[PDB]
Design an enzyme around this catalytic site. Structure first.
Site, PDB file in Angstrom:
ATOM      1  CG  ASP A 223      15.553   0.619  11.188  1.00  0.00           C
ATOM      2  OD1 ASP A 223      16.951   1.580  11.404  1.00  0.00           O
ATOM      3  OD2 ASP A 223      14.985   0.947  11.296  1.00  0.00           O
TER       4      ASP A 223
ATOM      5  CG  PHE B 193      -1.774  -1.032   1.242  1.00  0.00           C
ATOM      6  CD1 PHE B 193      -2.238  -2.423   0.937  1.00  0.00           C
ATOM      7  CD2 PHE B 193      -3.344  -0.894   1.084  1.00  0.00           C
ATOM      8  CE1 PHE B 193      -2.727  -3.398   1.185  1.00  0.00           C
ATOM      9  CE2 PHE B 193      -4.534  -1.544   0.715  1.00  0.00           C
ATOM     10  CZ  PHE B 193      -4.353  -2.929   1.139  1.00  0.00           C
ATOM     11  CB  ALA B 194       2.221   3.352  -2.006  1.00  0.00           C
ATOM     12  CB  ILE B 195      -2.412   5.712   1.139  1.00  0.00           C
ATOM     13  CG1 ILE B 195      -2.421   4.646   1.171  1.00  0.00           C
ATOM     14  CG2 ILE B 195      -2.751   7.444   1.388  1.00  0.00           C
ATOM     15  CD1 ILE B 195      -2.658   4.976  -0.098  1.00  0.00           C
TER      16      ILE B 195
ATOM     17  CD  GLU C  96       3.735  -4.928  15.074  1.00  0.00           C
ATOM     18  OE1 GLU C  96       3.956  -4.356  15.795  1.00  0.00           O
ATOM     19  OE2 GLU C  96       4.356  -4.963  14.638  1.00  0.00           O
TER      20      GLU C  96
ATOM     21  CB  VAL D 146       5.281   0.950  -0.032  1.00  0.00           C
ATOM     22  CG1 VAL D 146       4.991   1.537   0.944  1.00  0.00           C
ATOM     23  CG2 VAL D 146       5.757   0.979  -1.188  1.00  0.00           C
TER      24      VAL D 146
ATOM     25  CG  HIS E 138       8.773  -6.147  16.335  1.00  0.00           C
ATOM     26  ND1 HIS E 138      10.221  -5.818  16.335  1.00  0.00           N
ATOM     27  CD2 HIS E 138       8.364  -5.750  15.487  1.00  0.00           C
ATOM     28  CE1 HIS E 138       9.447  -4.155  16.141  1.00  0.00           C
ATOM     29  NE2 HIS E 138       8.779  -4.195  16.040  1.00  0.00           N
TER      30      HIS E 138
ATOM     31  CE1 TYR F 147       5.392   5.655   4.642  1.00  0.00           C
ATOM     32  CE2 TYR F 147       3.412   6.545   4.985  1.00  0.00           C
ATOM     33  CZ  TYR F 147       4.533   6.492   5.987  1.00  0.00           C
ATOM     34  OH  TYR F 147       4.892   5.846   6.827  1.00  0.00           O
TER      35      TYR F 147
ATOM     36  CB  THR G  56       4.636  -3.697  22.876  1.00  0.00           C
ATOM     37  OG1 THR G  56       5.116  -3.993  20.840  1.00  0.00           O
ATOM     38  CG2 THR G  56       6.008  -2.707  22.853  1.00  0.00           C
TER      39      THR G  56
HETATM   40  C1  LIG Z   1      14.366  -1.696  21.237  1.00  0.00           C
HETATM   41  C2  LIG Z   1      13.217  -0.823  20.382  1.00  0.00           C
HETATM   42  O1  LIG Z   1      12.260  -0.974  21.732  1.00  0.00           O
HETATM   43  N1  LIG Z   1      13.142  -0.566  19.695  1.00  0.00           N
HETATM   44  C3  LIG Z   1      12.103   1.012  19.613  1.00  0.00           C
HETATM   45  C4  LIG Z   1      11.102  -0.244  18.192  1.00  0.00           C
HETATM   46  O2  LIG Z   1      10.744  -1.687  18.633  1.00  0.00           O
HETATM   47  C5  LIG Z   1      10.003   0.777  17.785  1.00  0.00           C
HETATM   48  O3  LIG Z   1       9.381   0.176  16.418  1.00  0.00           O
HETATM   49  C6  LIG Z   1       7.934   0.361  16.044  1.00  0.00           C
HETATM   50  O4  LIG Z   1       8.002  -1.347  17.662  1.00  0.00           O
HETATM   51  C7  LIG Z   1       6.619  -0.790  17.337  1.00  0.00           C
HETATM   52  C8  LIG Z   1       5.761  -2.811  18.065  1.00  0.00           C
HETATM   53  O5  LIG Z   1       6.352  -2.282  20.108  1.00  0.00           O
HETATM   54  C9  LIG Z   1       5.627  -1.062  15.964  1.00  0.00           C
HETATM   55  O6  LIG Z   1       5.828  -2.539  15.224  1.00  0.00           O
HETATM   56  C10 LIG Z   1       5.973  -0.141  15.160  1.00  0.00           C
HETATM   57  O7  LIG Z   1       4.930  -0.255  13.889  1.00  0.00           O
HETATM   58  C11 LIG Z   1       7.244   0.339  14.963  1.00  0.00           C
HETATM   59  O8  LIG Z   1       7.776   0.997  14.057  1.00  0.00           O
HETATM   60  C12 LIG Z   1      10.293   2.294  17.169  1.00  0.00           C
HETATM   61  C13 LIG Z   1       9.743   2.877  16.896  1.00  0.00           C
HETATM   62  O9  LIG Z   1       8.554   3.000  17.782  1.00  0.00           O
HETATM   63  O10 LIG Z   1      11.154   2.672  18.222  1.00  0.00           O
HETATM   64  C14 LIG Z   1      11.880   1.743  19.203  1.00  0.00           C
HETATM   65  O11 LIG Z   1      13.274   2.271  17.940  1.00  0.00           O
HETATM   66 CL    CL Z   2       0.723  -5.774   4.134  1.00  0.00          CL
END
Ligand SMILES: CC(=O)N[C@@H]1[C@@H](O)[C@H](O[C@@H]2O[C@H](CO)[C@H](O)[C@H](O)[C@H]2O)[C@@H](CO)O[C@@H]1O
Ligand code: CL
Ligand code: HG
Ligand code: HG
Ligand code: HG
Ligand code: HG
Length: 263
Positions: A244, A60-62, A221, A130, A151, A65, A163
Site C-alpha cells: 500500500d 470474490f467481488a460482492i 485472517e 479484488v 503483511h 467491489y 495483531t
Molecule cells: C502501521 C499500522 O498499524 N497500520 C494499520 C494497518 O495495519 C491496518 O490494516 C489492517 O490491518 C489488520 C490487521 O492488523 C487487517 O489486516 C486489516 O485487513 C487491515 O486493513 C489499517 C486498517 O485498519 O490501519 C492502519 O493503517
Molecule cells: Cl481470498
C-alpha cells in the site's frame, strides 16, 4: 516425472556472495522468502512450463467491489503468470456486472454466482482480494505447496506486536511467545489440495468460535495466521507482493512493488 531443462546461459550463482544482505531470504524451516534478486525467473519459468502448470486465481467481488474487477483483471493480464496457463475464478453476486476483459491466449475466466472442480482444472490456487492492482511481475516464483504473504504493516514488527487473536477462548488464539510472521489474508495459495485443507480448517475453526460466541479480532485472517503457525508454509512472499504505497511509501528494501492496494 520431471523432464530435463535445456541448456541455459545465465550468471553463475556465487556461493560466497549472499543474495540479499538486508533481508531474511529463508525461514527457520527452510522455506524460501521471496524477494526480488533471490530468483532467476528464466530457470523457474522453464521448470513450471515443462510441467504445463495451470494456475487458478480466485477473487470474490460482492456488492460495490465489482467495480474493482476491470483494473484487477486488466493488470493481472499484464503481470500475472504471463506465459503460463491461467484460469480466473470470479465469485460474485452480480454476474452481469463482470467487465468484458480481453485475455491473452491460454487464459480463461469463469464467473461463479454466489469445489472438486478446482482439482481437475488447475494445479495451484492463488487467493487474493479484488480491490488491488498488479504493478509488476507476479509469477511462478510464488508457486509451492502452501504459501503465505508477509503483511505490509508488520514485516518489521516483533511478535508481541502482531495483531493475532489473543483470547484463549478463540480457536485462532496465539500467545505472546509464539508466532513466526503476521501473514495478510489478502494473498495466499498453494496446491489445490493444500489450499482446500487450509480453507476447510479455517471454516471449521470459525464455526467453533461462532458456537462459543466469539469472533476473532481479524476474522479469517486471524485463523489463517493460526493455521500457518501450525502448518508452516513452504514459501513466504515478501511485502513486494502485498503493498500500500499511499500508506507505506516505497522503502529501499522493496526493489519492486508488484501487487498493491487501489488508492
Ligand atoms: C502501521 C499500522 O498499524 N497500520 C494499520 C494497518 O495495519 C491496518 O490494516 C489492517 O490491518 C489488520 C490487521 O492488523 C487487517 O489486516 C486489516 O485487513 C487491515 O486493513 C489499517 C486498517 O485498519 O490501519 C492502519 O493503517
Ligand atoms: Cl481470498
Ligand atoms: Hg541473489
Ligand atoms: Hg481460494
Ligand atoms: Hg474461514
Ligand atoms: Hg483461512
Amino acid at each position: 516425472f520431471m523432464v530435463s531443462l535445456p541448456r541455459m546461459v545465465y550468471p553463475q550463482p556465487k556461493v560466497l556472495t549472499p543474495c540479499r544482505k538486508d533481508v531474511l531470504v529463508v525461514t527457520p524451516w527452510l522455506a524460501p522468502i521471496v524477494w526480488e534478486g533471490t530468483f532467476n525467473i528464466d530457470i523457474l519459468n522453464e521448470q513450471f512450463r515443462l510441467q504445463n502448470t495451470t494456475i487458478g486465481l480466485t477473487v470474490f467481488a460482492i456488492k460495490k467491489y465489482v467495480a474493482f474487477l476491470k483494473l484487477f483483471l486488466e493488470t493481472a493480464e499484464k503481470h500475472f503468470m504471463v506465459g503460463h496457463r491461467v484460469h480466473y475464478y470470479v465469485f460474485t453476486d452480480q454476474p452481469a456486472a463482470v467487465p468484458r476483459v480481453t485475455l491473452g491466449t491460454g487464459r480463461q475466466l469463469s464467473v461463479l454466482e454466489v469445489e472438486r472442480r478446482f482439482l481437475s482444472e488447475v494445479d495451484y490456487l492463488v487467493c487474493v482480494d479484488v480491490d488491488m492492482e498488479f504493478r509488476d511481475h507476479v509469477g511462478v516464483e510464488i508457486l509451492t505447496p502452501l504459501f503465505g504473504t508477509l503483511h505490509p504493516s508488520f514485516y518489521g514488527s516483533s511478535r508481541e506486536a502482531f495483531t493475532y487473536e489473543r483470547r484463549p477462548q478463540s480457536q485462532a488464539y496465539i500467545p505472546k511467545d509464539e508466532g513466526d510472521f503476521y501473514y495478510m489474508g489478502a494473498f495466499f495459495g498453494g496446491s489445490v489440495q493444500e489450499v482446500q485443507r487450509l480453507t476447510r480448517a479455517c471454516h471449521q475453526a470459525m464455526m467453533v468460535d461462532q458456537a462459543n460466541g466469539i469472533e476473532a479480532v481479524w476474522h479469517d485472517e486471524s485463523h489463517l495466521n493460526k493455521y500457518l503457525l501450525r502448518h508452516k508454509p513452504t514459501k513466504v512472499l515478501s511485502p513486494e507482493y502485498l503493498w500500500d504505497q499511499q500508506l507505506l511509501g516505497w522503502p529501499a528494501v522493496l526493489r519492486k512493488l508488484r501487487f498493491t492496494a487501489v488508492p
